Structures are given as structure tokens and as C-alpha cells.
Design an enzyme around this catalytic site. Structure first.
Site, PDB file in Angstrom:
ATOM      1  N   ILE A 119       0.767  -1.274  -0.085  1.00 22.14           N
ATOM      2  CA  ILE A 119      -0.236   0.034   0.043  1.00 22.14           C
ATOM      3  C   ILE A 119       0.874   1.288  -0.030  1.00 22.14           C
ATOM      4  CG2 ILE A 119      -2.096  -1.160   0.900  1.00 22.14           C
ATOM      5  CD1 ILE A 119      -1.065   0.501   3.709  1.00 22.14           C
ATOM      6  N   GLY A 120       1.982   1.159  -0.098  1.00 25.77           N
ATOM      7  CA  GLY A 120       3.117   2.148   0.218  1.00 25.77           C
ATOM      8  C   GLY A 120       4.391   1.899  -0.089  1.00 25.77           C
ATOM      9  N   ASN A 121       5.350   2.892  -0.287  1.00 24.44           N
ATOM     10  CA  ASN A 121       6.608   2.781  -0.102  1.00 24.44           C
ATOM     11  C   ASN A 121       7.419   4.172  -0.025  1.00 24.44           C
ATOM     12  OD1 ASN A 121       6.152   3.784  -2.902  1.00 24.44           O
ATOM     13  ND2 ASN A 121       7.188   1.840  -3.985  1.00 24.44           N
ATOM     14  N   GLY A 122       8.880   4.015  -0.055  1.00 26.49           N
ATOM     15  CA  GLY A 122       9.729   5.387   0.163  1.00 26.49           C
ATOM     16  C   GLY A 122      10.920   4.999   0.203  1.00 26.49           C
ATOM     17  N   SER A 123      11.884   5.836   0.622  1.00 22.05           N
ATOM     18  CA  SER A 123      13.285   5.321   0.303  1.00 22.05           C
ATOM     19  C   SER A 123      13.578   4.244   1.506  1.00 22.05           C
ATOM     20  CB  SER A 123      14.318   6.538   0.289  1.00 22.05           C
ATOM     21  OG  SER A 123      14.830   7.096   1.691  1.00 22.05           O
ATOM     22  N   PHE A 124      12.746   4.344   2.629  1.00 20.68           N
ATOM     23  CA  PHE A 124      13.049   3.659   3.835  1.00 20.68           C
ATOM     24  C   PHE A 124      12.811   2.179   3.383  1.00 20.68           C
ATOM     25  CE2 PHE A 124       8.667   5.281   3.570  1.00 20.68           C
ATOM     26  CZ  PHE A 124       7.841   4.098   3.716  1.00 20.68           C
ATOM     27  N   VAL A 132       8.946  -0.290   2.313  1.00 19.29           N
ATOM     28  CA  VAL A 132       7.604  -0.797   1.690  1.00 19.29           C
ATOM     29  C   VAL A 132       6.608  -0.835   3.130  1.00 19.29           C
ATOM     30  CG1 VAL A 132       6.363  -2.334   0.312  1.00 19.29           C
ATOM     31  CG2 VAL A 132       8.797  -2.138   0.085  1.00 19.29           C
ATOM     32  N   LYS A 186       5.095  -1.202   8.418  1.00 24.81           N
ATOM     33  CA  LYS A 186       6.363  -0.601   7.713  1.00 24.81           C
ATOM     34  C   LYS A 186       7.508  -1.263   7.866  1.00 24.81           C
ATOM     35  CE  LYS A 186       8.345   4.116   7.345  1.00 24.81           C
ATOM     36  NZ  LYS A 186       8.608   5.133   8.447  1.00 24.81           N
ATOM     37  N   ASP A 218       6.922  16.867  10.116  1.00 20.33           N
ATOM     38  CA  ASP A 218       6.272  16.376   9.162  1.00 20.33           C
ATOM     39  C   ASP A 218       4.632  16.605   9.028  1.00 20.33           C
ATOM     40  OD1 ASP A 218       6.327  16.127   6.176  1.00 20.33           O
ATOM     41  OD2 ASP A 218       6.343  13.703   6.558  1.00 20.33           O
TER      42      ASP A 218
HETATM   43  C1  65A Z   1       3.886   4.617   6.938  1.00 25.19           C
HETATM   44  O1  65A Z   1       2.477   4.625   6.231  1.00 25.19           O
HETATM   45  C2  65A Z   1       1.493   5.529   6.210  1.00 25.19           C
HETATM   46  C3  65A Z   1       1.942   6.912   6.272  1.00 25.19           C
HETATM   47  C4  65A Z   1       1.214   8.111   6.048  1.00 25.19           C
HETATM   48  C5  65A Z   1      -0.015   7.753   6.125  1.00 25.19           C
HETATM   49  C6  65A Z   1      -0.854   6.602   6.232  1.00 25.19           C
HETATM   50  C7  65A Z   1       0.161   5.627   6.056  1.00 25.19           C
HETATM   51  C8  65A Z   1      -0.438   3.912   6.018  1.00 25.19           C
HETATM   52  C9  65A Z   1      -1.549   4.126   4.877  1.00 25.19           C
HETATM   53  C10 65A Z   1      -3.099   4.112   5.173  1.00 25.19           C
HETATM   54  N1  65A Z   1      -3.663   4.012   6.190  1.00 25.19           N
HETATM   55  C11 65A Z   1      -2.761   3.665   7.230  1.00 25.19           C
HETATM   56  N2  65A Z   1      -3.294   3.392   8.464  1.00 25.19           N
HETATM   57  N3  65A Z   1      -2.266   3.433   9.283  1.00 25.19           N
HETATM   58  C12 65A Z   1      -1.107   3.446   8.661  1.00 25.19           C
HETATM   59  C13 65A Z   1       0.229   3.465   8.920  1.00 25.19           C
HETATM   60  C14 65A Z   1      -1.385   3.698   7.355  1.00 25.19           C
HETATM   61  C15 65A Z   1      -4.116   4.477   4.023  1.00 25.19           C
HETATM   62  C16 65A Z   1      -3.385   5.047   2.717  1.00 25.19           C
HETATM   63  C17 65A Z   1      -3.208   6.711   2.877  1.00 25.19           C
HETATM   64  C18 65A Z   1      -4.346   5.045   1.333  1.00 25.19           C
HETATM   65  C19 65A Z   1      -2.012   4.503   2.418  1.00 25.19           C
HETATM   66  C20 65A Z   1      -1.208   4.470   3.633  1.00 25.19           C
HETATM   67  O2  65A Z   1      -0.047   4.690   3.077  1.00 25.19           O
END
Ligand code: 65A
Length: 339
Positions: free
Chosen positions: A27-32, A34, A50, A141
Site C-alpha cells: 500500500i506504500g513505499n519510500g526510500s525507507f 515498503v 512499515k 512532518d
Molecule cells: C507508514 O504509512 C502511512 C504513512 C502515512 C499515512 C498513512 C500510512 C498508512 C496508509 C493508510 N492507512 C494507514 N493506517 N495506518 C497506517 C500506517 C497507514 C491508507 C493510505 C493513505 C491509502 C495508504 C497509507 O500509506
């Protein structure tokens, strides 16, 4: 498909226990690394994980910080565990929406989030900031995308502590932090002796964005950010510049008055709040507790206040001594008679 790992609980004794999860999904990624969503097999509850590359040359700072924190408006670290070059996995609560996404649905329809929601969301963000700042932690942030939101309960949780840090009088810090639009002017001038008040600059930018339907200061770059700020606040005073960085060519521009900045039926109390948050001089900004005590949030202290879906408000008044420690007499305003 079930994954079982040995994880230590986020808050507790270091007591590693087997934990099982399923339904894994990027659902996500970054330089850190996934970020995943997963379902915990025991409770069925949803979680984000994370996953972060760690070397052994360092304690992870985000982890150190997450273990200290326990608060209804901060995302909870449930567990943490190591996996296969070794990675750290932070298991966090999963909340499917953010202020950013909710606010954007409004904005894409040329519409304005109702003020009651702006009060609720801003208030809880200020709480979360009082809590972390009482430990001397600065988030670095604050932006709408890092505010988790359950839109049925109107509960807000601060998340993403990967830039967060303890600030110590006389330890310099990196000036290029915060997302650009939310970045305090002292940071743009290159200050390295800044305080927690940068988080408050950011918060007023979030508030302003929620009253405008779009970012108040949309900068082309780190430096054009300052120009955008100046269009609205005007050029800063010589004493203002010294308060930001005691140690850049720009023309001379006068302040747009705060009442002209927002839509005309905008409540005076929001404008007044905003103006004590988006000040050049960092020490002139309100503290997060003072901001919670602001009159803008008085509707939330009414005993009959209700969400627009008819339900009750979430917890707004259960303050701890930790949370109140910067200015304890504020409790007379903060905890109203009906509690
Ligand atoms: C470290 O990850 C995040 C960093 C910032 C904001 C949300 C998240 C993560 C995410 C989401 N719900 C979340 N609930 N809890 C977490 C953690 C988290 C839903 C999104 C916005 C569609 C995708 C997402 O990355």
C-alpha cells in the site's frame, strides 16, 4: 496464507510472542522500504506494517519514539519484528482514510468542509502535538496526508514519525525538513537552532488549507516557498528575521489583512487562531495546549455537542498530567464543568 513471526509488543515488557497475520498487500513505499496492510489472524483487526532496512550501526529513531508514545490521537505501535541484510517491521494500526483524502473529495467538488469537522480535526491534532512536545519530540512532518481519520467517529490520529526527533537546546538540526508547503519560515532561512514551534507553523497551514480548499502557500521550491509566504504575511521586520535565524534578495510587500485571505462567511475565531499560528517570530506562535484552549474550539466544549451523524464526539477532555505539564491552569478552560 498465514505468516507467523516472533514480535515484541510495542508497549510492554520485551516479551516476544508469536504473532500471525494474513491478507498481505503492498500500500506504500519510500526510500525507507515498503508499507503493507495485513489482517491479524487472532483478532481479525487490520494493520499496516512499515518495513525498513536497518543496519546494526544504529538504533532506529522512529522505533525509539514509537515505544514511548501512548495516546488516543497518535497511531499505535502494536508490535515490531525483524525479517530478511535485515529489516525492521513496525506493525501499526490501520485507518483507511486521511484528512488529506477527505478534504480532497470536498475540494474536487468546489465545496468546503463544514466548520464542525475543521474544529474536531484541528483540535485533535493540537492534542497530539501537546502530547509529543511534552516529551520534547518534534514531528517535523505535520501535513494532512499524515493525519489518519476514521470519518464515522471523527477520530484523528497522527502518524508517520520517520522525520520525528528529540530536540535538545544547543544540538543543531537539519534545516531542510517538513514537506515544503507546510515548512516554517525559520527553516527556509536555514535555521538549525529551531524549536517545536515549527510543528505549529505546519498546523496553521493545515487549518488554513481546510478553510481554503487548497494549500495556502504552494511553493515551486524550497526558496519560492518563502515568496508565497511573503505574499500573505508580507516582508518580515528586521527583528522578525533575527528571531528566525540570528546569523536572499526579495522586494518589499505589505501584509494582506487576515480577513481578506479567507472566504467571506469564515468565522472570526478561525482567522484569529490562524493568525497566532502563522507568525514569523517562532516564539510568538501559540503552544499546542494554548491552541486547544482557543475560543474557536468552544463549540466542542458545549455539553450537547454531537457529530453530524448524530453520534457523540470522541474523547476530547481526558487530559493527563503529562499532556497538561507545560501550562496546568489551562485545565479550567480545557476540561469543562460537565466533565
Ligand atoms: C507508514 O504509512 C502511512 C504513512 C502515512 C499515512 C498513512 C500510512 C498508512 C496508509 C493508510 N492507512 C494507514 N493506517 N495506518 C497506517 C500506517 C497507514 C491508507 C493510505 C493513505 C491509502 C495508504 C497509507 O500509506
Amino acid at each position: 496464507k498465514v505468516t507467523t513471526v516472533v514480535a515484541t509488543p510495542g508497549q510492554g515488557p520485551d516479551r516476544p510472542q508469536e504473532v500471525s497475520y494474513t491478507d498481505t498487500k503492498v500500500i506504500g513505499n519510500g526510500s525507507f522500504g515498503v508499507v503493507y496492510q495485513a489482517k491479524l489472524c487472532d483478532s481479525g483487526e487490520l494493520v499496516a506494517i512499515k518495513k525498513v532496512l536497518q543496519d546494526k550501526r544504529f538504533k532506529n529513531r522512529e522505533l525509539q519514539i514509537m515505544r514511548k508514545l501512548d495516546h488516543c490521537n497518535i497511531v499505535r505501535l502494536r508490535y515490531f519484528f525483524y525479517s530478511s541484510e535485515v529489516y525492521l517491521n513496525l506493525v501499526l494500526d490501520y485507518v483507511p482514510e486521511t484528512v488529506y483524502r477527505v478534504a480532497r473529495h470536498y475540494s474536487r467538488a468546489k465545496q468546503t468542509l463544514p466548520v464542525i469537522y475543521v474544529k474536531l480535526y484541528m483540535y485533535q491534532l493540537f492534542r497530539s502535538l501537546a502530547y509529543i512536545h511534552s516529551f520534547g519530540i518534534c514531528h517535523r512532518d505535520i501535513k494532512p496526508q499524515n493525519l489518519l481519520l476514521d470519518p464515522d467517529t471523527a477520530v484523528l490520529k497522527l502518524c508517520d514519525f520517520g522525520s520525528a526527533k528529540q530536540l535538545v537546546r544547543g544540538e543543531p538540526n537539519v534545516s531542510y525538513i517538513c514537506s515544503r508547503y507546510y515548512r516554517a519560515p525559520e527553516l527556509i532561512f536555514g535555521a538549525t537552532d529551531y524549536t517545536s514551534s515549527i510543528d505549529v507553523w505546519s498546523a496553521g497551514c493545515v487549518l488554513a488549507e481546510l478553510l481554503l480548499g487548497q494549500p495556502i502557500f504552494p511553493g515551486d521550491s524550497g526558496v519560492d516557498q518563502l515568496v508565497e509566504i511573503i505574499k500573505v504575511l508580507g516582508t518580515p521586520t528586521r527583528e522578525q528575521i533575527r528571531e528566525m535565524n540570528p546569523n536572499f534578495k526579495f522586494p518589499q510587500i505589505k501584509a494582506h489583512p487576515w480577513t481578506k485571505v479567507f472566504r467571506p462567511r469564515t468565522p472570526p475565531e478561525a482567522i484569529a487562531l490562524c493568525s497566532r499560528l502563522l507568525e514569523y517570530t517562532p516564539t510568538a506562535r501559540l503552544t499546542p495546549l494554548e491552541a486547544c484552549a482557543h475560543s474557536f474550539f468552544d463549540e466542542l466544549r458545549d455539553p450537547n455537542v454531537k457529530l453530524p451523524n448524530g453520534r457523540d464526539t470522541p474523547a476530547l477532555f481526558n487530559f493527563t498530567t503529562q499532556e497538561l505539564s507545560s501550562n496546568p491552569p489551562l485545565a479550567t478552560i480545557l476540561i469543562p464543568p460537565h466533565a
